[PDB]
């Protein structure tokens with residue numbers, strides 16, 4: 001039974017219930033993430049920015065079932081076009097706006113990756129992707145507003161692939177944490 005999360009801590013408790021088993025009800029998880037009304041005081045601890053690129057800040061390890069993290073995007077910061085390593089990805093905006101651009105999986109032949117679509121993800125909205133749907137790029141295209149997003153990955157993964165938009169060629173990347181549980185992790 002899905003109730004509105006009152007706070008980030010309440011959200012985390014609810015997520016632990018929703019991931020108690022071995023499968024994932026995507027629509028329920030997305031609904032509860034959307035229902036949490038971002039409260040900046042609750043996540044300030046995790047909102048650690050870097051001047052040069054976006055940062056990943058681990059919030060909860062989900063009793064091994066998921067990684068919950070906060071990503072902090074300076075003005076003009078964005079990601080590679082990437083996959084999600086056979087895992088679910090939920091992405092909820094906590095502050096600002098992000099542009100999500102969707103791409104299909106490349107063919108074997110070297111070719112420009114042409115965007116399938118794009119959308120602007122706004123405060124409190126929760127998007128979802130998995131490898132069956134496709135690839136995406138996420139960017140804070142703002143010149144004036146930093147963005148903050150809350151990401152849930154299940155199962156957790158620490159590697160993925162970045163894709164060269166010019167060719168479709170992929171490279172394995174290991175994702176690094178900027179902080180864990182509020183502690184900077186150089």
Ligand SMILES: [Fe+3]
Pocket residue numbers: 082083084089136138
């Ligand atoms: Fe992603």
